[PDB]
Point group: D2
Chain length 246, copies 4
């Protein structure tokens, strides 16, 4: 369903990004997955190979103006034009607002929201020239719902959806779609961090009565990347097991 | 010639209003994904034409008569399905009508027929199928809404009330049934090239394109792809959601 | 005050939220016609308004009946005057899991809570259009946006109310009539109680008067640029 | 001196309104003042701060005009310290200051992206952090953030503004969850298209097209946003928190 397309997936070394990279690969995409370190990029390349997926690893820091512009320029001139871009990379730095350090606020906004500008800007010319593209941004239920101790993360993740909607309006006439996928609580390193009794508490808020799997997010992203999703744009697709319904 | 099993292999799926338009495309897509597909029409001739369409496309299933506005018709048809093909584990509530008018000009029948066909049908169909899904510990209910539910539209207070009600229904039922691994979701199309949109005045359809970032009406196949995805186990963690499929005409 | 000279019609005004809405519009200077299903309720409305120094009347009204509404409003508009503020608040619940739900439980909630909007709105729009001013305010529920197990009928009706609100707002805006919804959370009208409060950031149930204050504001000239809105009044239980 | 008026809904509350020198923030400062608040309004220039002071005085409102740049960590720190040391502890805070730097994303310069997020979104962290301890000690507060219909709707040419304004709502909801137990509400108001300098800058052809999208068939007035903010600041809205109230003439309905 994606044969002949190049996909770029940011944050593909583990968790949701890794499942996304493998799923797009399963669909026939050549996959460029990113990590913040050389060894991470090397491991991505090997993991894709181990799964029979063609592609490469890329060292990328989406919080850095230079790391994005320079690395994307290189790939587009020398290797090829990504027509599917999944902005998956993201971090949390939680604290009540009165206890939150300046770096905790700015690092989350800069990594999780400003990254969308850096990546999208680097890839849009190729998509507009091809008259085809998919930009898929990984948001969070916390964007719609809010969560105490996460004003920075809620701000960035809600901002991600606003970005999604406005860009979908700019590029729709060139058959590029822009969508968000907002996971609920998914079994990854990010969630394994939370204290035990808080995870037991989260389950009581979820109608399906379980955490989600990274593969479940990846399936949804794989669908949006496909031709069958061509009339879906500016949407946020919640994948949260019923934790939040809007 | 033994093909590979597809994502819905062997599941019995019921699609209301599969005689034409979005419902027909949904029926064919679920059939492509390996479901046994029962599609319905409001007349015997429509039911026969569904059976012919399924066979021409190599889909196992049946065409049946169903009027979702009628308690007696839902009961009779669902009894027949349970007896002759089995209990549906995928149900797509697609049947719907419009009876447009400004509220001050609206006739009682225009209000009540739209609420009764588009909203009360969700109670009739879901009540009939839920016990089978709960016993199987798996199910998919997918309700076809409309952008008009979220956005509103002049001349469509009846339709907007019904289609927004469909989303409230979807969210509440998702909460009742999640613990049995049944998901309940809505898909809200924008403006799709079907008989329904082709009914609107020419000048209105052209003004419509200017509001849609993609610059075109959607195709029925584009809604059907989304529904086929939600029916699969790839969408098992999606419940109580409304997925807009409107070409960016409305973003929420 | 801000509503002096206007007639307001408030359905379901015999207690709770509807009563508080009636009193608030009254305190703002409206002449208030509050409705009830029974003679006892209608007489209670009249007495309560009087006791609070509000001018108005009680009216027997069955919002589920095409005839009761159409006739009873035609009467008011020909003898008492023209309601320019209309609050649709009359509402019922019939709770049950969908698999256990009886036909009457589904249909009575949709007919009373949703179809009533059509009956009342149809009856009052001519007077508002002539006046070139109006307020229609529909009382929904957090259950509309959030869903609740055991209340598929109520959630359908109350979400339907918001869709009706937005579509009607589009129809009538050119005449300076606004149409809005207010969605209360859990309002004060002992183990599951502490569980419920844990879902509410403010940590308390709402007061009926807190809903009425929001309705009062939407009714005023200050809310003239608000239309097609749903205002949640739920202590942060649900955020949209 | 001999005339005593009735106390109003915000009587004696210290309020801070960022960007009160014109437009919506000016209307808001005057509305809060009419409601009995002591009003501190801010501008980015000494001239604008003087204009605020004079507008308040002409309207018989007690308060002050001050210079504040909400994009600057140092300006926010020093101004909020000055306010606490000599004016009062703001219990009502309206984050109204905001800008646009429009361009298609492919033509957008880095400074246009960053200035909009930094002015319109990062300002919420700067201001809220500076005022919360005062509200938590009083066990009462109101934070009211001025968003935009563009946050929910999106708009071509405004990816930066849409991201900032949608982020503002996410911030609102999360902060409302944190502070609710101290009876501090946090809400957003999302104007549509209001007759101010920001909208008057759009070309005439684009403004006339806008009117075709608005059911009420007119732009809103700054005073119409101010009335809504003044209500949310009152105890009449004590049970509303984490809400976004759209004030857009029906242009966008969510
Ligand atoms: N897990 C969950 O329950 C939820 C997750 N999400 C969102 O899903 C996305 C992935 O989450 P999850 O898989 O849990 O996260 P993990 O923390 O497991 O993985 C984070 C990934 O992002 C990469 N990354 C982090 N910072 C940067 C950066 N500055 N530049 C480039 N890459 C970076 C990491 O690279 P490396 O390995 O080099 O560090 C890694 O691949 C995130 O956007 C998260 O916010 C949303 C809702 C719920
Ligand atoms: N087309 C569009 O742009 C949009 C469509 N939708 C929704 O998508 C769904 C299908 O729309 P579309 O394909 O355009 O519609 P069509 O009018 O083309 O087809 C309607 C289908 O529903 C059936 N139907 C009508 N009334 C009943 C009834 N009482 N009981 C059972 N079946 C009935 C019809 O059967 P028969 O052939 O016997 O008449 C037909 O199969 C509807 O719910 C519609 O509201 C939502 C948004 C936009
Ligand atoms: N007008 C409209 O249709 C809409 C407006 N809005 C939002 O409403 C708010 C008010 O807008 P509006 O009145 O139209 O805008 P104007 O541009 O007319 O006024 C903006 C105000 O913000 C102040 N300001 C700008 N930058 C800063 C800064 N860095 N630090 C401190 N103050 C600053 C300005 O100060 P000074 O006078 O010194 O320049 C001015 O008082 C903004 O957040 C805007 O995004 C949202 C939707 C629609």
């Amino acid at each position: 369903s994606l044969q002949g397309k190049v996909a770029l997936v940011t944050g593909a070394s583990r968790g949701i990004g890794q499942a996304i990279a493998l799923e797009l690969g399963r669909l026939g995409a050549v996959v460029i997955g990113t990590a913040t370190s050389a060894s991470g990029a090397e491991k991505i390349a090997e993991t894709l190979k181990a799964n029979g997926v063609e592609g490469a690893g890329l060292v990328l820091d989406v919080s850095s103006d230079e790391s994005v512009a320079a690395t994307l320029e290189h790939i587009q001139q020398h290797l090829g034009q990504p027509l599917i871009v999944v902005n998956n990379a993201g971090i949390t730095r939680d604290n009540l607002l009165v206890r939150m350090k300046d770096d905790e606020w700015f690092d989350v906004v800069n990594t999780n929201l400003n990254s969308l500008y850096r990546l999208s800007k680097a890839v849009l010319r190729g998509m507009t020239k091809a008259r085809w593209g998919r930009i898929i941004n990984i948001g969070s239920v916390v964007g719609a719902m809010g969560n105490a101790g996460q004003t920075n993360y809620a701000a960035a993740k809600a901002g991600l959806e606003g970005f999604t909607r406005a860009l979908a309006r700019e590029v729709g006439s060139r058959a590029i779609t822009v969508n968000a996928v907002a996971p609920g609580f998914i079994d990854t390193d990010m969630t394994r961090e939370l204290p035990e009794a808080q995870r037991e508490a989260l389950l009581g808020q979820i109608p399906l009565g379980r955490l989600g799997q990274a593969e479940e997010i990846a399936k949804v992203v794989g669908f949006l990347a496909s031709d069958g999703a061509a009339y879906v744009t500016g949407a946020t697709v919640p994948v949260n097991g019923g934790m939040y319904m809007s």
